Amino acid sequence: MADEKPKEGVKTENNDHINLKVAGQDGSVVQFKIKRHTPLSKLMKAYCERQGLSMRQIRFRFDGQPINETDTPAQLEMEDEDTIDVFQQQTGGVY
């Protein structure tokens, strides 16, 4: 005989997901989908690696401000499907 039972209409171990880009000004891009607390640096390390560059040689921005190694889609107050920007730097050389 069948071992059947109805299951209760709650699912407490869910979380929220959000879709973020990381985009360079060479038009180079990665789509990601992360939980609303997941750190943005995990996305920005992987971008920087597939480009081959040192994370040191680059700045990052969103909605008018910098991103830190700990900012989250909660911390920045982000709505879904947005873009993070990446940027180069130009110190040294002949003055």
Partner: peptide, 13 residues
């Protein structure tokens, strides 16, 4: 084709 990476941040044995 590979412009896609999937990421979360809680881990344990």
């Amino acid at each position: 084709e590979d412009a896609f990476i999937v990421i979360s941040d809680s881990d344990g044995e």
